[PDB]
């Protein structure tokens, strides 16, 4: 992976959540997520994918991952996906948008999905 | 997994894309995705998560998954995440919204992400 | 407006909501919206814009509009924007995605915005 | 309008775009938008709505607006809607998410809509 070492590690977003990830040579993302907000406590499993051979023209590295909000402590009957790009450098960043879908009845499905944006950095 | 057997299998969306998934007892989703549209050919690896203990009140089962659009044939320097819910029954469905992020330069990052919605069924 | 007459009128979405709109020659959209779901009763003012000189290559006509969910009956302290395209023909459609933002405290702002998709037709 | 005076004026986002708006007592937003990026030059008409009687519990004020990207100079056959909330104070802000839909053929409609997020301030 061209950015395998740049992506692997601990990241933090603007909410104070902690994203712990390992980037595999094959494009895999594996790790844990701890949300500072919402119906969440402690760590949750995450899995995702990244472009392991990104362009060399200065572009970011596309990636995404999922958390289902069930662990041994809580189950919020919901899943978030983050879709974004890694941008390397002295101030490396992962800039994302996300979709949080909750399980709902059919009558409430129109209101099942929140959208937002998180920026992750190696400090904070 | 309460819906492990309902989710595992081959699904098709309204574009004619093919989503092949296995739901594990631990909440994992693993499989392949073949898109009928865009800069894509043949199968791509996917990974994701689902709620393996959903509510029993008639609500759907939250889930999500990621594809990075690199395989042995092509690399579109992009990743899609689908966030949604599985709804079981004689006409089972997976209803999703998705975010497709491309690696971009910083100057083009404002236009990095497409959004849309796919519905998957067991027929088509 | 090339599609002024095609857009003006009463439309209905998959939820049973009623979208009453007038397209002006200058690109304006004006009318009322009645939602069949959520914290809403009776009609709300809407305003928006459309491309009054669309491409002639078979493409749809881009448009968007806003409703703030305050009227003489209720105030849900929220606003929805629909962004989409009009597609003319015997089965005319307006295909949209939407963002529903609620006023929140700063601590809850991460969960302020719902996303979804509505399809409007001239029948239903 | 409770925030009529707070909203009316000139705002700037993180891209350097200029949002000039008047908030009416009736909930209307009217003004012009100038984008620093994309297929845009000079000012475009905008219209939208805001909650003219927001909650008094510290919550933001919900609002939204639309620009169709046609003016006397250019027509990009597209429309953006911004959905967000105004947050008053010494560092007032309008925090938004947006959907940019382009007119497309049916075959390309899956890729018609970009999503992003802009923050507007009274300085910059
Ligand atoms: O809260 C969660 C799980 C944790 C999500 C944290 C998000 S992920 C994106 C963002 N980035 C982060 O680092 N943290 C946050 N899921 C339900 C969200 N519900 C609302 C909500 C908001 C705040 C508090 C409680 N509920 C929805 C709901 C739908 C139906 C019934 C009930 N509730
Ligand atoms: O096309 C892909 C990969 C395949 C995506 C298929 C999607 S996933 C959601 C939806 N559901 C499906 O089953 N299929 C589709 N990624 C790039 C999208 N580009 C546009 C695009 C659209 C159509 C054709 C070519 N390009 C973006 C781009 C950003 C910068 C430079 C260049 N291109
Ligand atoms: O319900 C509304 C106004 C009507 C929206 C109808 C939408 S517009 C898109 C879609 N298309 C339609 O035709 N109808 C619907 N706004 C608040 C949404 N709240 C959830 C909600 C969902 C269901 C019932 C009550 N609340 C949010 C909330 C955030 C904080 C506190 C409290 N509530
Ligand atoms: O560029 C525009 C109009 C200006 C949008 C500025 C946005 S609004 C949200 C954000 N906030 C701002 O202040 N500025 C920006 N519309 C087309 C976007 N196209 C891509 C694009 C991106 C960059 C340059 C040219 N094209 C799409 C396209 C779809 C089919 C064919 C062709 N093109
Ligand atoms: Cu909740
Ligand atoms: Cu390349
Ligand atoms: Cu972003
Ligand atoms: Cu492309
Ligand atoms: Cu439960
Ligand atoms: Cu949907
Ligand atoms: Cu509500
Ligand atoms: Cu043209
Ligand atoms: Cu759509
Ligand atoms: Cu363009
Ligand atoms: Cu109130
Ligand atoms: Cu935001």
Author numbering:
A (entry chain A), B (entry chain A), C (entry chain A), D (entry chain A): 11 to 134
Paper text:
Our work utilizes biotin–streptavidin (Sav) technology to develop artificial metalloproteins (ArMs) that mimic the active sites of natural copper metalloenzymes. Our group develops artificial metalloproteins (ArMs) using biotin–streptavidin (Sav) technology to mimic natural metalloenzyme active sites to characterize otherwise elusive intermediates and study the effects of the secondary coordination sphere on metal ion(s) reactivity. This approach leverages the strong binding affinity between biotinylated metal complexes and the Sav host to confine synthetic metal cofactors within a protein scaffold. By engineering ArMs with aromatic residues within their secondary coordination spheres, we systematically investigate the influence of these residues on Cu reactivity and oxidant activation. Our results demonstrate how the inclusion of aromatic residues within the secondary coordination sphere influences the structure and reactivity of copper ArMs.
Notice that the relative abundance of the m/z peak consistent with the singly oxidized species increases and replaces that of the unoxidized species as the most abundant. These results contrast with those obtained with 2, where in the absence of tyrosine, only a small amount of oxidation occurs (new peak at 16 381.2 m/z) and the unoxidized peak (16 364.8 m/z) remains the most abundant. Upon reaction of 2 with H2O2, we could identify the triply charged DF31 ([DF313+], 1055.5 m/z, retention time 3.1 min), and a relatively small amount of the singly and doubly oxidized species, though their relative abundance is significantly less than in 1. The premise that S112Y is modified due to its positioning was supported by LC-MS (and MS/MS) analysis of the trypsin digestion of 2 and 3, where treatment with H2O2 resulted in only minor modification of the DF31 peptide (G and S20†).
